[PDB]
């Protein structure tokens, strides 16, 4: 889901 990408990017960095 495209609307999940920023969440995953944020988690990957956080």
């Amino acid at each position, epitope marked *: *889901n*495209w609307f999940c990408i920023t969440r995953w*990017l944020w988690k990957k960095k956080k």
Partner: antibody
Amino acid sequence: QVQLVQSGAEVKRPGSSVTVSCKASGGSFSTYALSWVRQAPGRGLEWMGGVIPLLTITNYAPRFQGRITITADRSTSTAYLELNSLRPEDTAVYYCAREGTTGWGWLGKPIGAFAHWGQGTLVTVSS
Amino acid sequence: EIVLTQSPGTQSLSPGERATLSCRASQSVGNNKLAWYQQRPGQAPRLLIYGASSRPSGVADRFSGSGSGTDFTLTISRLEPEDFAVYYCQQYGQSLSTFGQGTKVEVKR
């Protein structure tokens, strides 16, 4: 405090193309989803597509694939919407909206839903 | 291609009254990613609820959202003058996001 400022009103002839801009300020640009929603006079909201600046990851609604191009310049925190082969049916106010962030602050984990909206840009398509 | 249904399209209610709005989805909405927006005439939409039930900071508590799967509901405990407007529900459970046609809440007098 996320503020989105869109370019001014446009008047186009059918078949022509239009490019509307959206400059963000008051937060980070790259790591947040930014979409384009439109609303025809007296009608409902329509999600058109979006982009994640960091890797220019675009997501277009099938209905516009081929006529729509969404870009984003990280150097100026500005996103763009280009719509080609305009038709009177495309007459509408176009809004750019950025997803909100968890709880307080704005560096929290994105929420997907559109919390920030530009002022809107009226694009008229007529002869 | 999730179709969102909001009905009635219009409701007439008295001030201070409670309001409940419905939003049906053709298919299950992924991760319950359902959101509600408020839009007053001449103004841009405003996010009221996201994640089917999370109220973002800066939004009065008289606004509550519920539901899951394909059934969802927005509730306004008491309608203040500024609450009479159009409400749209959107689902972002998949790459192709969609909005309902909206429900308009007018003042019954």
